[PDB]
Amino acid sequence: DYPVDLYYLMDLSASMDDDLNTIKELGSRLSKEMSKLTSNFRLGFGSFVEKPVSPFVKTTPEEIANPCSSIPYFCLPTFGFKHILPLTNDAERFNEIVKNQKISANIDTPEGGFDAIMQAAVCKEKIGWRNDSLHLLVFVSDADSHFGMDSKLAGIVCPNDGLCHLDSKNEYSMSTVLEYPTIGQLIDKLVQNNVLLIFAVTQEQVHLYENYAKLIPGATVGLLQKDSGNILQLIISAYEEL
Amino acid sequence: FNLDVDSPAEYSGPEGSYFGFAVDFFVPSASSRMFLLVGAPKANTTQPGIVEGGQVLKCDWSSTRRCQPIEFDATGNRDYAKDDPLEFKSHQWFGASVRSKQDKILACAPLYHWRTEMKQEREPVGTCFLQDGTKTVEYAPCRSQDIDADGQGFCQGGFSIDFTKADRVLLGGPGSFYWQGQLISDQVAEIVSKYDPNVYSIKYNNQLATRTAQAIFDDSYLGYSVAVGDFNGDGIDDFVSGVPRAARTLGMVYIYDGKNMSSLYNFTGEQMAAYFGFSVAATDINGDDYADVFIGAPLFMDRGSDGKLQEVGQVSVSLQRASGDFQTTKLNGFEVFARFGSAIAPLGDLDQDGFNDIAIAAPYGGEDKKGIVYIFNGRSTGLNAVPSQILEGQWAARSGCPPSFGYSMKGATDIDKNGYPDLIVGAFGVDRAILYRARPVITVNAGLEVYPSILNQDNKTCSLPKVSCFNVRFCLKADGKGVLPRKLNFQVELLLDKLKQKGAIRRALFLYSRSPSHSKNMTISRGGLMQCEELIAYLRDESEFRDKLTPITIFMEYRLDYRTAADTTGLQPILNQFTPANISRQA
Ligand SMILES: *[C@@H]1O[C@H](CO)[C@@H](O[C@@H]2O[C@H](CO)[C@@H](O[C@@H]3O[C@H](CO[C@H]4O[C@H](CO[C@H]5O[C@H](CO)[C@@H](O)[C@H](O)[C@@H]5O)[C@@H](O)[C@H](O[C@H]5O[C@H](CO)[C@@H](O)[C@H](O)[C@@H]5O)[C@@H]4O)[C@@H](O)[C@H](O[C@H]4O[C@H](CO)[C@@H](O)[C@H](O)[C@@H]4O)[C@@H]3O)[C@H](O)[C@H]2NC(C)=O)[C@H](O)[C@H]1NC(C)=O
Ligand SMILES: *[C@@H]1O[C@H](CO)[C@@H](O[C@@H]2O[C@H](CO)[C@@H](O[C@@H]3O[C@H](CO[C@H]4O[C@H](CO[C@H]5O[C@H](CO)[C@@H](O)[C@H](O)[C@@H]5O)[C@@H](O)[C@H](O)[C@@H]4O)[C@@H](O)[C@H](O[C@H]4O[C@H](CO)[C@@H](O)[C@H](O)[C@@H]4O)[C@@H]3O)[C@H](O)[C@H]2NC(C)=O)[C@H](O)[C@H]1NC(C)=O
Ligand SMILES: *[C@@H]1O[C@H](CO)[C@@H](O[C@@H]2O[C@H](CO)[C@@H](O[C@@H]3O[C@H](CO[C@H]4O[C@H](CO)[C@@H](O)[C@H](O)[C@@H]4O)[C@@H](O)[C@H](O)[C@@H]3O)[C@H](O)[C@H]2NC(C)=O)[C@H](O)[C@H]1NC(C)=O
Ligand SMILES: *[C@@H]1O[C@H](CO)[C@@H](O[C@@H]2O[C@H](CO)[C@@H](O[C@@H]3O[C@H](CO)[C@@H](O)[C@H](O)[C@@H]3O)[C@H](O)[C@H]2NC(C)=O)[C@H](O)[C@H]1NC(C)=O
Ligand SMILES: *[C@@H]1O[C@H](CO)[C@@H](O[C@@H]2O[C@H](CO)[C@@H](O)[C@H](O)[C@H]2NC(C)=O)[C@H](O)[C@H]1NC(C)=O
Ligand SMILES: *[C@@H]1O[C@H](CO)[C@@H](O)[C@H](O)[C@H]1NC(C)=O
Ligand SMILES: *[C@@H]1O[C@H](CO)[C@@H](O)[C@H](O)[C@H]1NC(C)=O
Ligand SMILES: [Ca+2]
Ligand SMILES: [Ca+2]
Ligand SMILES: [Ca+2]
Ligand SMILES: [Ca+2]
Ligand SMILES: [Mn+2]
Ligand SMILES: [Mn+2]
Ligand SMILES: [Mn+2]
């Protein structure tokens, strides 16, 4: 018997409409099996897309408020990272959030996943990490992710300090101001906060992200299927501790 | 080692403008004055309605340290039609990359957006302005009819630039073909001749371009950095470019022929997301007339002694051979998170030793993450892995961007005609550029003869009202290689029987000076002949000291009066590093 915290980081990018219904079936299913092996269970939620700056998103007045234009389709505007749910015991509130999630969009296939990982890791307050618990961070995206110095194209040359930059809207306010974090920076902040990063991607993205998990200590990888109980098999076989 | 850090020239631009984001030199027609070219891509200009268009400033070295803006474009946004703006020059980052060749200055705006000529878009195709004296022309090879992300709409042409030796421009466009990237090369004779202010998509016949490939190569960022040099042994400068996201973020470097745009050689990073290819440079470092490839990976993580990973950055040094192969070594950075390898500037032969040298910057290293530039010297076997000089940042980081001292730099240009190439270092985070002048290097060969070696206890020979004496002959010769005066004034000190600390019993002192030490001001001429001088010292009597076991070491020390060897610009020379010291012998 031991307390466990689990944050659910979902990618709301455009490439996730084909995988959306599998992610919601992962939320509710995970919001059930967690109460089994432990009684001290609190879970949270966060969403990300991309940095809202050219060239990653078109800068036309219509495609800013509706980046799914020219398709046509109505979707949420492009945002860096939004912290929606601080981790709490209320697990039926978690489900109610995943259901209402709509798709967003951008242009370039890799996304700003690392921005969301960095902000959720360092912020021990606005996310609410326990003192002595298993800080698990499930990462879900069906594409690659941008790292350091890639924002130079956008005109962003101030590096990421790896600090808590969530505004009153609980969003990444310093997303258009700071670069993406590098793997070195993530490793330096996933240990200071002691966070186990679980990669949950698609088949074509595993061979890539598995080499990322080799660099990041403790970080493992996982596959996304219609029966998303596989990723649950990780967590159950991660409660081994010892 | 010979860079003057005592009195460097400090140039400044408007605050908050990222002054120093790109730097270069300026050497116009005939034997004129020389200038510094500094980029400030976030600088507000006087352009109507254009907010933070950016500018490139011409700063004068001759004296006074005053900077003057270069008028590349004074106009605002052209209209395609009424209430239908054609372009967006606001926040276009003009001056993000500056490259100069003789009286030619090429500056570019990577974040320049342009509206399609078919419909109302805002696509960042990038544009450049070229100045060959008076005439100013525009250059936008990605502003074409190949629109949208699938084409050149997000090309961002001019993100990196360079010149060849045959008047060809090399442009990098990381966003072309759904961010596959593209390299475009045009002859300067065609750029100005085919320029038309009423034509927004100019097609050039002698254009060399990397055409679109399969969809797996999307999101590769070909053209992120560029450099030029001959590699296939023909005489035409070939195109080297970093592809940092290729090979699943392993990073690669593509080499293309500078005549028909064909792939010649490849390099591949060895660590995921190390940004292998962030910066590249090409210069012959080992004196074989074959340009050598320097690839920076500022995000490279190495393993520490404790088993913990640490991000230090890595630069790979690849020596070109006539047999086609490459001898590659790797140079790891010194400070964690410093991003060693972010900028690589060939320096020429900084110290005029016969082998080119190079600088590598760690813009976020040093105390308070201010910035460090490391100087590396070449040799017959290649690059010296240990730096001979460390350039330290002096400017603290106000809130916002770090000083980023070293983030961009350029060398191999002798701006003060002193015989040595100098170095410009940009620090855009504090809107500053600093000129470091190379000090002349003096090689000194000192000699010391003591005859006889064995002093008898009673050998009276030299005239005196006669005691056991001997001749001390010391020779001195100096030389330099550059613009330095002929007459170098040396102040030489000699100390007999130094081994005896102050308070002990001394046993030697000169014959006429009557003093264990003799001072002498010595004007010697470099290059002429070795000037030597003899003098007689004697030993004390037996009854004056029972200590006949402590060997008497004759110590010779020499130094220079830099002030009388300084230049009109106040640049004081400096001694070569491995052998500047004094010398000792013993009797
Ligand atoms: C250093 O490393 C780098 C990186 O690895 C390397 O550079 C790459 O080298 C590889 C070498 O193989 C190059 O790969 C070649 O790419 C050719 C692409 O050019 C033509 O082919 C296009 C193919 O279309 C693809 O997509 C369609 C679906 O859309 C698909 O059906 C096709 O099968 C194919 O996958 C073609 O479309 C394109 O045509 C353009 O223009 C026409 C108009 O004429 C227009 O209609 C098109 O829409 C398009 O806009 C273009 O002409 C490719 O042809 C070539 O194919 C060879 O290999 C295959 C597989 O083995 C054979 O079956 C085939 O017969 C050929 O032999 C090959 O795949 C890659 O392009 C390089 N990348 C660059 C340059 O950026 C360097 O070479 C390395 N250095 C060294 C020294 O090796
Ligand atoms: C785009 O441009 C590139 C170069 O700009 C063109 O690439 C050229 O292809 C031709 C083939 O059509 C090659 O010529 C061959 O030369 C052979 C003899 O070797 C000579 O070339 C060597 C090149 O240098 C070498 O070292 C460098 C390292 O510095 C390597 O990178 C390089 O690959 C070379 O290995 C010289 O060093 C050497 O001294 C020689 O001078 C010939 O044997 C060969 O075939 C001839 O003979 C055949 C029968 O024997 C006959 O049938 C043929 O018709 C032909 O006459 C051929 O001549 C060039 O060497 C090569 N360039 C370079 C720089 O290597 C590319 O073809 C072009 N593409 C298009 C579409 O135009
Ligand atoms: C007792 O002390 C005596 C004086 O201190 C010692 O006499 C010395 O003996 C050595 C030989 O061992 C002499 O050295 C020789 O010098 C000649 C000539 O060199 C000179 O000439 C050139 C120009 O031609 C000039 O540039 C030089 O500066 C010299 O002035 C050399 O050619 C020989 O090879 C040889 O080395 C000394 O010159 C001599 N001293 C003096 C003052 O003449 C004597 O040896 C001591 N006795 C001992 C130790 O038992
Ligand atoms: C270049 O010029 C532009 C203006 O043409 C400058 O942009 C201006 O930036 C300031 C702050 O840097 C903005 O003022 C701010 O307003 C808020 C109120 O909303 C206030 O609380 C802040 O304290 C601050 O005063 C100003 O609105 C903005 N102007 C425009 C037109 O957007 C820019 O800073 C200049 N840059 C350089 C390098 O000179
Ligand atoms: C003559 O100059 C040399 C310079 O090489 C002096 O050697 C230094 O000695 C001190 C302590 O003895 C060391 O801390 C330095 O590192 C030495 N210098 C170098 C370059 O290694 C030597 O001391 C001088 N002679 C005398 C008598 O002081
Ligand atoms: C536990 O949390 C409290 C506040 O909730 C804090 O004061 C204390 O330092 C924490 N202990 C450890 C070991 O982190
Ligand atoms: C040599 O010049 C120095 C000044 O550089 C002076 O202090 C010294 O007295 C001079 N020595 C002689 C012997 O004239
Ligand atoms: Ca060539
Ligand atoms: Ca070489
Ligand atoms: Ca040298
Ligand atoms: Ca100089
Ligand atoms: Mn996506
Ligand atoms: Mn999908
Ligand atoms: Mn994206």
UniProtKB/Swiss-Prot annotation, chain A:
Subcellular location as annotated: Cell membrane; Cell junction, Focal adhesion
Positions of disulphide bridges: C68-C75, C123-C164
Carbohydrate-modified residues: N131
Family designation: Belongs to the integrin beta chain family.
Stated role: Integrin alpha-V:beta-6 (ITGAV:ITGB6) is a receptor for fibronectin and cytotactin. It recognizes the sequence R-G-D in its ligands. Internalization of integrin alpha-V/beta-6 via clathrin-mediated endocytosis promotes carcinoma cell invasion. ITGAV:ITGB6 acts as a receptor for fibrillin-1 (FBN1) and mediates R-G-D-dependent cell adhesion to FBN1. Integrin alpha-V:beta-6 (ITGAV:ITGB6) mediates R-G-D-dependent release of transforming growth factor beta-1 (TGF-beta-1) from regulatory Latency-associated peptide (LAP), thereby playing a key role in TGF-beta-1 activation. (Microbial infection) Integrin ITGAV:ITGB6 acts as a receptor for Coxsackievirus A9 and Coxsackievirus B1.
Clinical note on disease: Amelogenesis imperfecta 1H: A disorder characterized by defective enamel formation, resulting in hypoplastic and hypomineralized tooth enamel that may be rough, pitted, and/or discolored.
UniProt protein name: Integrin beta-6
The species this protein was found in: Homo sapiens
Lineage, opening ranks: Eukaryota, Metazoa, Chordata, Craniata, Vertebrata
First-to-last residue of the parent protein present: 130 to 371 of 788
Swiss-Prot record, chain B:
Protein's membrane topology: Single-pass type I membrane protein
Glycosylation sites: N44, N260, N266, N459, N521, N582
MF GO annotations: coreceptor activity; extracellular matrix binding; extracellular matrix protein binding; fibronectin binding; integrin binding; metal ion binding; opsonin binding; protease binding
Keyword Repeat carried by entry: yes
Cysteine disulfide partners in this protein: C59-C67, C108-C128, C142-C155, C462-C469, C475-C532
Binding locations of Ca(2+) 1: D230, N232, D234, I236, D238
Amino acids binding Ca(2+) 4: D414, D416, N418, Y420, D422
Keyword Cell inner membrane included in the entry's annotation: no
Additional remark text: The constitutive activation of ITGAV:ITGB3 on neoplastic cells may contribute to tumor growth and metastatic potential.
Family listed: Belongs to the integrin alpha chain family.
Name by which UniProt lists this protein: Integrin alpha-V
Residues of the full protein shown: 31 to 620 of 1048
